Design a protein around this ligand. Structure first.
Ligand SMILES: [Cl-]
Ligand SMILES: [Cl-]
Ligand SMILES: [K+]
Ligand SMILES: [Mg+2]
Ligand SMILES: [Mg+2]
Ligand SMILES: [Mg+2]
Ligand SMILES: [Mg+2]
Ligand SMILES: [Mg+2]
Ligand SMILES: [Mg+2]
Ligand SMILES: [Mg+2]
Ligand SMILES: [Mg+2]
Ligand SMILES: [Mg+2]
Ligand SMILES: [Mg+2]
Ligand code: NA
Ligand code: NA
Ligand code: NA
Ligand code: NA
Ligand code: NA
Ligand code: NA
Ligand code: NA
Ligand code: NA
Ligand code: NA
Ligand code: NA
Ligand code: NA
Ligand code: NA
Ligand code: NA
Ligand SMILES: [Sr+2]
Ligand SMILES: [Sr+2]
Ligand SMILES: [Sr+2]
Ligand SMILES: [Sr+2]
Ligand SMILES: [Sr+2]
Ligand SMILES: [Sr+2]
Ligand SMILES: [Sr+2]
Ligand SMILES: [Sr+2]
Ligand SMILES: [Sr+2]
Ligand SMILES: [Sr+2]
Lengths: 194, 65, 56, 81, 46
RNA sequence: GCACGGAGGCGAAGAACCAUGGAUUUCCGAAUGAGAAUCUCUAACAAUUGCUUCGCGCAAUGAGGAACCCCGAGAACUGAAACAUCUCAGUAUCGGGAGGAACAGAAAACGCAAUGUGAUGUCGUUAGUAACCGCGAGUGAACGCGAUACAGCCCAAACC
RNA sequence: AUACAGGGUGACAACCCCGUACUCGAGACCAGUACGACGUGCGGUAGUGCCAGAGUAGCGGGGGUUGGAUAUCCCUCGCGA
RNA sequence: GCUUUACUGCAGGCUGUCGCUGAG
């Protein structure tokens, strides 16, 4: 039969309709009054969290992060530039907002490692994402068959090197064939043309 | 030289400390005679005294005092 | 008053001093920042790739 | 562990202080206070220290001028080292 | 000026280094302090 | 010790010297009780976190490293015999971060179209080919093939 | 001479000295890998619309980037299975 | 370097539209 989780899932396919609509209208009022990174006891989208690796266990942390909406916040050129490199307004950054959110969260919790993240809406001037972080130093986690992999030394600061799911997608690593000629195995090795 | 490692290990903790203060004093007096430009020196000892003290201090830590 | 010799006589201010962190006489005692190693400005050590030829 | 007294400071001026004012002069650890210099001295030569003046020298060391009580005789104390 | 205790220690060292290479070193090496400094002609650090 | 002096000393209680392990290891320094041009003032994981016996009790982070590596920011001189798209070039340089190597990686692949191949790097080639481009100057792959090395698995949910 | 590499030594040295050939020993890396062994249990038939990752797939506006040309990858605003 | 109704662009301001954005 349908899991209770599927109901949370199905509700979020249209965050603008039904009860969820009312919840968001109510919630965001409080979120707007919260900081940039607020730790929270429980995921707002349980099905998503569990699906991404979340577990109700010691060493598993969830935090909501908000980031200003829109394109790049760039300063116009103070030195000579050819028309091409004079743009300022319509230029956007190469990292999506979710990635910026994952990094801020990870900065707030220096000892934790980003496991994954997902969206929880936005208003006209900002977007919110909840990030799942794991404590690689807690025994409850060092002994987990599903999460202990994140305790390895080469997993340290994984978010800052683009090793997150959002990181890999944003680096154009989804496709295994056509279109990934310059993304795999890394943007840098391909001369940075991906 | 005159003081060997066995002899030191054979001393009780109290003896090593009494021997330590003794050595420190000879040294201090040598450094005093040196400050006065005194020549009745024997440069080899001023050097031995330091090593002796290092030995006793090394042994003390080893034995747990 | 000329900008040369006559103006050099007024220089009796102490700015750069021996730095606690790196030892170079580059700790600006008025800014409390080392122009050589970055002490007072950054926990990380002051460094730049332009301090050497690009391919070296 | 650093000691307080390094060595006696013996010079013309030091001798005068010793013959005319019952004062002894020492090169001491620059981290030592006047009080710590007083104690150390009383415990090394068994005397009563009345006053201690200090100076951080241009030799990188600290010099102490220790005046003994009228009970003690500097000339004699210094004469046994 | 007013020198601190540390400044003083550093000045003291500079004064000490500013000495002659002992004569016996001359003999031992069978034949110069390249760091000889003058208070006037030179400028120390800090 | 370098270092071919003087004096003196150590070594058969086996020194010197070498290897391995241990002891000691001032102050500043990420520098962390507060402050400071290496010092000073009156018990210290400062700061941010996780766990929590909710007490800094147990832990993490910080900074370094020749380059290599990953993620971001990103010129201009120059070429086009001017120059704006283009080029130089995702180069120089900047921000962040890991390791001994990184990154990638078990197909919502390929599409020598097949009764065919079978995770991923990399090397040789495919090829200056296809593609781009004031269709100018210039830019420029991939599938495949021959090699190197080979390795495949774990969750979410269903039912409990 | 399984040693005629090289160096040193008061001048051109296989045989003056260190070495060199041969043989042997130890540490490090390979690697906590390979092998081996413990446990676990592969797989097949029939029925069953019970389960299988959403601002996603996809579309449009604006940018960047790419050999990617209608047919590259990415960012952003909007819409959206 | 400077100028302008030189060429081409870029900030900035004004203005419409979409999102923020709801009820009658
Ligand atoms: Cl991380
Ligand atoms: Cl094929
Ligand atoms: K140009
Ligand atoms: Mg399982
Ligand atoms: Mg005074
Ligand atoms: Mg002098
Ligand atoms: Mg401190
Ligand atoms: Mg040109
Ligand atoms: Mg690579
Ligand atoms: Mg032309
Ligand atoms: Mg190119
Ligand atoms: Mg292909
Ligand atoms: Mg370009
Ligand atoms: Na972190
Ligand atoms: Na002295
Ligand atoms: Na001077
Ligand atoms: Na040491
Ligand atoms: Na700590
Ligand atoms: Na605590
Ligand atoms: Na030209
Ligand atoms: Na020109
Ligand atoms: Na072009
Ligand atoms: Na073929
Ligand atoms: Na591109
Ligand atoms: Na778009
Ligand atoms: Na000009
Ligand atoms: Sr780190
Ligand atoms: Sr004037
Ligand atoms: Sr004048
Ligand atoms: Sr002045
Ligand atoms: Sr600062
Ligand atoms: Sr640097
Ligand atoms: Sr002097
Ligand atoms: Sr002068
Ligand atoms: Sr294979
Ligand atoms: Sr699936």
């Amino acid at each position: 039969a349908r899991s209770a989780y599927s109901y949370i899932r199905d509700a979020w396919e249209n965050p603008g309709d039904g009860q969820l609509a009312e919840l968001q209208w109510q919630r965001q009022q409080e979120w707007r009054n919260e900081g940039a990174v607020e730790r929270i006891e429980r995921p707002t989208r349980l099905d998503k969290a569990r699906s991404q690796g979340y577990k109700a266990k010691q060493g598993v942390i969830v935090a909501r992060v908000s980031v200003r909406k829109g394109s790049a916040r760039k300063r116009r050129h103070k030195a000579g530039r050819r028309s091409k490199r004079q743009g300022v307004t319509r230029i956007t950054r190469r990292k999506d907002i979710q990635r910026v959110a994952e990094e801020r969260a990870s900065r707030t919790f220096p000892n934790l490692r980003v496991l994954n993240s997902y969206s929880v809406g936005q208003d006209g001037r900002q977007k919110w994402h909840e990030v799942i972080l794991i404590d690689p130093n807690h025994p409850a986690i060092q002994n987990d068959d599903d999460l202990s992999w994140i305790c390895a030394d080469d997993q340290a600061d994984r978010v800052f090197r683009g090793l997150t799911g959002a990181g890999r997608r944003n680096r154009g690593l989804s496709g295994k064939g056509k279109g990934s000629e310059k993304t795999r195995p890394s943007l840098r090795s391909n001369g940075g043309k991906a | 030289t005159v003081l060997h490692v066995q002899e030191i290990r054979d001393m009780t903790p109290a003896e090593r400390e009494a021997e330590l203060d003794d050595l420190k004093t000879e040294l201090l007096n040598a450094r005093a005679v040196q400050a006065a430009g005194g020549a009745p020196e024997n440069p080899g000892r001023i050097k031995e005294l330091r090593k002796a003290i290092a030995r006793i201090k090394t042994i003390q830590g080893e034995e747990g005092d | 008053t000329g900008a040369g010799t006559p103006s050099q006589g007024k220089k009796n201010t102490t700015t750069h001093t021996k730095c606690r962190r790196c030892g170079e006489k580059s700790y600006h005692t008025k800014k409390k920042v080392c122009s050589s190693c970055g002490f007072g400005k950054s926990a990380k050590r002051r460094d730049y790739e332009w301090q050497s030829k690009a391919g070296e | 562990s650093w000691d307080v007294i390094k060595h006696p400071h013996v010079t013309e001026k030091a001798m005068n202080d010793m013959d005319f004012q019952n004062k002894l002069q020492f090169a001491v650890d620059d981290r030592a206070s006047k009080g710590e210099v007083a104690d150390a001295v009383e415990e090394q030569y068994d005397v009563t220290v009345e006053q201690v003046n200090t100076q951080n020298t241009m030799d990188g060391e600290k010099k102490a001028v220790v005046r003994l009580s009228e009970d003690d005789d500097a000339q004699e104390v210094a004469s046994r080292i | 000026g007013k020198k601190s205790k540390a400044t003083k220690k550093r000045l003291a060292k500079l004064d000490n280094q500013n000495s002659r290479v002992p004569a016996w070193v001359m003999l031992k090496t069978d034949r110069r302090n390249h760091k000889r400094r003058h208070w006037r002609r030179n400028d120390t650090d800090e």
